[PDB]
Write a protein that binds this DNA or RNA. Structure first.
Ligand SMILES: [Ca+2]
Ligand SMILES: [Ca+2]
Ligand SMILES: [Ca+2]
Length: 300
DNA sequence: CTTTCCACTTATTCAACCTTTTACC
DNA sequence: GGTAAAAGGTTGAATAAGTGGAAAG
């Protein structure tokens, strides 16, 4: 229902590569003729502060329902079957490029099973369980028990290229960070101001992440580990690269959500640095206050 | 019988954050 | 030497992904 301008379709695909998810529920249901009912869909869950992105996607595609996900988050879910055609037409024309493309392909296979009403019979349920085994986190314990002949095997790697800077604006709206690092320094003011751009992602998309270096013509990859988990970040710390390469990209290709406000505050700091005001008392004061009112410091 | 919606749950991949060290001139 | 750039990380929660129940014809 939003009357805000519609979201650009590539920005939407990039935001979905970041934050979207495909869903296939295969549920025990003793009122169904086959003993199972299904539900197929696409969904995005965000913090409450970004509910307006969900409204804007809802009004762009003209489909989906919005509901709370606990007290601090909100979802857009599309599962009405005819409305899934809008989702398929979109991602066929503006395709995903992360490993999530493999989940879209499994969703589309499932759509074809359900469109033929095959899932109302046991052959169709078996084909959906085969599809679901490869989808996201795979089969539940109960489905593994009911369908032991379905082996869980690893998926082929997706290797696609960034299509344009609109996709990148949508993806950065999901995964990006515009950070102002205030480094204790042996300098006259005692504080070094360093702007840091990052995009963060699991190691499954290392090839895509490395390609950001050539696509943007700057930056580097940092590797991370915590517990059983590994991920990467594309990082830019060189001020001329931030000012001449990163900032113009998102000035031209507008971010969505609260993160736009953080980007615009970050650009105020970059203008001060370009003017060397970050090495003055008044400039440092302004930058300290900007830090306190962006990202985690922003009130909601 | 099946679809659709709305309330609700949960593991970790994200974002955002820090300090210290080295590069550069 | 002093400023910029990179290195070397930590961690809490907004994401992704999933689950429970039932209204409706
Ligand atoms: Ca993501
Ligand atoms: Ca995000
Ligand atoms: Ca501001």
């Amino acid at each position: 229902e939003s009357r805000r301008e519609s979201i650009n379709p590539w920005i939407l695909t990039g935001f979905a590569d970041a934050e979207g998810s495909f869903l296939l529920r295969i549920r025990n249901n003793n009122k169904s003729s086959v003993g199972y009912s299904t539900e197929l869909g696409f969904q995005i869950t965000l913090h409450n502060k970004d509910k307006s992105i969900l409204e804007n996607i809802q009004s762009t595609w003209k489909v989906g329902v919005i509901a709370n996900s606990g007290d601090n988050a909100v979802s857009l879910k599309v599962t009405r079957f005819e409305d899934l055609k809008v989702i398929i037409d979109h991602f066929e024309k503006y395709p995903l490029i992360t490993q999530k493309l493999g989940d879209y392909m499994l969703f589309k296979q499932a759509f074809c099973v359900m469109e033929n009403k095959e899932h109302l019979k046991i052959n169709g349920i078996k084909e959906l369980v085969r599809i679901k085994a490869k989808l996201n986190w795979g089969l539940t314990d109960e489905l593994k028990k009911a369908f032991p002949e379905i082996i869980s095997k690893e998926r082929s790697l997706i290797n696609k290229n960034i299509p344009n800077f609109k996709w990148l604006a949508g993806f950065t709206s999901g995964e990006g960070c515009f950070f102002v690092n205030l480094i204790k320094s042996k300098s006259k003011l005692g504080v070094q101001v360093q702007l840091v751009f990052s995009i963060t992602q699991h190691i499954k998309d290392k090839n895509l992440m490395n390609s950001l270096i050539t696509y943007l013509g700057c930056g580097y990859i940092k590797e991370y580990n915590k517990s059983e988990f590994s991920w990467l970040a594309f990082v830019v710390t060189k001020f001329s690269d931030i000012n001449d390469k990163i900032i113009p990209v998102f000035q031209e290709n507008t971010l969505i959500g609260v993160k736009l406000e953080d980007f615009e505050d970050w650009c105020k700091v970059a203008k001060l640095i370009e003017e060397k005001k970050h090495l003055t008392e008044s400039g440092l004061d302004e930058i300290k206050k900007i830090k306190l009112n962006m990202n985690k410091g922003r009130v909601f």
